[PDB]
């Protein structure tokens, strides 16, 4: 009866219900057909039935509700909406709408949107007086966000020297130097574990670009939140379509005062199908890249604001280096000062066995005062001073015995302080 | 009614605005295109509509007029003025021209003006017999800027210490080589205090290239002038036209027997986006920078001139080194002997949170006896005596603590007479 | 319609041949004008036709000829169009006196073939050419007239000095430019001022 309660159940138990229904041959066939099918079975008794997504515009004019179980993926089961409802309700792409769908009639594939109740968890006519994200004035962070977690007292220190390091607050632009096989991946699962924890309240959303079909998988198990991915074989198109589907989402949400937390992974990959898709201009610069096609991932990774009207939008990505292309040497380059925290990691470190492999010296972060307090941030200054002569590897092994026999940071802050 | 009036307006009272007028569906849209409704739906009513802003002129003839409110971007409510008018009154790019404009009939997007009543700030007529900046005649600086700021006696010692390390008069063309991470933007900050209090005749613009988008917004809300700026995700050609914009507009204020000062940041980042949009000549240089790809940015930056006649134009610029990039050490290596006035900062000294990092016997000025006087270049001198044996770290806590127990410069340089 | 428009606006004499008449009549009135013409121009009299269109005038010509056996390219004999270069031909200055000055519109692109082949034959047999582009009239901006395409010869003779000098100005600066940015560049230049003199003395500031 309603979309998405049926997209959420188990495949095996789909099929299930679709053979008392009285339909026939759904094992063999894949999933989106089913959903499709046991809908149209349904839609012959005459019950109204319930649906919702993510709407985007196509440049025809028309649009569809896409669902983020489907990581937004183009099937037979997405809501169609005529472009006259455009006009009705004020709709972008990236918001949610909810509402009852029609039957498709003769010689349409799609559902209808009947009635629209609920525009991004709020009332259409809300919706329609909320200001546009472009016209709200984007101010420093200002809202400390904790990534140490105490309960958990987890024998992996990376939430603890990821606040030493350099503190993450709402609304931050920071990106992540991680060359290959330094602990990238797990990184990025160990903060998604800490702002499910420390800040339920917070919206999280993890988007992945060129990944693993089991990488997926996992990371959709571990983070509790909302997580949308591409897989490496399809098109380069489709990276950009979902690219573009996450930051308008979290866009819409923003203008509601609410706060969106987003992991990118990774700003290379990104950059490698936006390259792709945009036509060639005439002129080739150096690595094969042209300007305007390293302008819309600027776009994208530049949309991280804090609101000063109230809630905010922190990206967190992560950029490639030594991976043996030149082309991602050059997307690197351009993104150097473009971001307010800065975390790189360092392979030799992980070649020791120690994690996180962290360069503490070469880490850092902007505004530090608007987040910290004033007895906090001079204890990190003291901490730096002593790190700063030591090397870049010999710096990880002593904070990490030094924060191993501790139970949080303030005891760790403390006993610097003796010295 | 007016335009001017209009822009200045919050975000959230031009929705309102417009929502009695007449007018629907404003809530969700740029604020750009409200602006244009708006005057759009009053244009009906027959009421004359008054507008001002900043003239260009485009390669094709005509030329738009562009409001600096939202950083001379491009508009649908730009002011369209017809070649017949520059004819009747000599326009150039940068100027400022105010007057009634008049509703667009159908076929075009653009207001079109009516009657021009004001050229900068000036009556129309006298205007036209100003003369060029490039006729007048380039001069030394005399006129001394005390930067140093009595009332306030915060505990920052930056503007203390910039007059003791280099003196900055009107007309200098002094740059400063800041390392990453050294204090640059709040450098600029606190120079930009002291002239909007000490200097409010004084007219000052802050331009600032690829900064991110909540920098620009604290600039503007500490800075009491104008602040113009361009983000990094817009294109390099987006630079360029901002960076020509603003000397236009200074030297056609120049021409009026005005000062203006001109803070620049960056150097290293202008020359980046001039580099790129000029078109190859077939032949490339050490780090891929052309010959004349520089001479663009050694036009902007020698325009700053001390007016024999009357006024002066004052542009102060940072210099990055040490970012690891050849691009950018090039381009210092040409900009170093074309200032009048030098001042290093070193990232050691940042490192010893100590600051303001500043090289003292690196920093320095050519022709201070003008800025200066008498019995104040004597003590100058004999501080820099005792100053030069000691190194470039061990200087500033020396220069700090003789500082910090003064009143004033005065104070300072008395005790100082008595070793 | 288009005659009785003709006729209000033109101060002179008119005369035409509807479609419905028979390609017959579009001979014999074709005819009527260049003779009636030349007879003026004995008498020391200019005269000045404007002709529409040199194929629609082939062909009418085209029929009425008897068929001599063989058919060429397109269904057009060569002795057909033998006609039409007799009544184009015509155009001559006197020296004894007098001057018989003959304009024509050729058709393109109407996706016949006839129009074609009368086109091809009557390329090189004009003193000055005027070529129109419908690309420009498509932009809403008139005349649609491609300058570089469009020239004459033995221009010399009608200019004086200097202004045949400033002529070769403005051709080498609008040579470079596209056929269709030509025009805009032009028209808002002419615009503003108020004759060609003026024009003229603006382009040599640059
Ligand atoms: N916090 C951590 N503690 C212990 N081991 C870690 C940690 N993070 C990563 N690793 C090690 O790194 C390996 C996986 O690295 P991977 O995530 O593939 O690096 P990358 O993402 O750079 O390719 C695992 O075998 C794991 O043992
Ligand atoms: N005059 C000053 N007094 C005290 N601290 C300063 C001063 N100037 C800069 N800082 C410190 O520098 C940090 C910001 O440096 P930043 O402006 O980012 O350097 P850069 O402009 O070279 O990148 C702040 O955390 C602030 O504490
Ligand atoms: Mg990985
Ligand atoms: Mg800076």
Known sequence: MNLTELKNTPVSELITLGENMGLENLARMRKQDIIFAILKQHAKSGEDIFGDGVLEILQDGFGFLRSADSSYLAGPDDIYVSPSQIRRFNLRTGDTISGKIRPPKEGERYFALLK???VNFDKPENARNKILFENLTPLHANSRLRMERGNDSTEDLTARVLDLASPIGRGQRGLIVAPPKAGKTMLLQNIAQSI??????????????????????????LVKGEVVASTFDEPASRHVQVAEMVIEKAKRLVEHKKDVIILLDSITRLARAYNTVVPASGKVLT???????????????????????????????????????????????????????????SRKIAEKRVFPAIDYNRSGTRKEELLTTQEELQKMWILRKIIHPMGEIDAMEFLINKLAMTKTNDDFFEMMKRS
Chains 1, 2 share one sequence.
């Not at 924890?197 to 198990?221: A, G, K, S």
């Not at 819309?296 to 950029?319: D, H, W």
């Not at 030594?322 to 473009?338: A, N, R």
């Open 116 to 118: 629209v109740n609920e």
């Open 287 to 345: 690595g094969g890249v042209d300007a305007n096609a390293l302008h819309r991932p600027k776009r994208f990774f530049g949309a991280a604001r804090n609101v000063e009207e109230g809630g905010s939008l922190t990206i967190i990505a992560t950029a490639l280096i030594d991976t043996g292309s030149k082309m991602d040497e050059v997307i690197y380059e351009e993104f150097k000062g473009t971001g307010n925290m800065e975390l790189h990691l």
């Open 196 to 221: 499910a924890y420390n800040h339920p309240d917070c919206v999280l959303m993890v988007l992945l670009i060129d990944e693993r079909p089991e990488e997926v998988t996992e990371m959709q198990r």
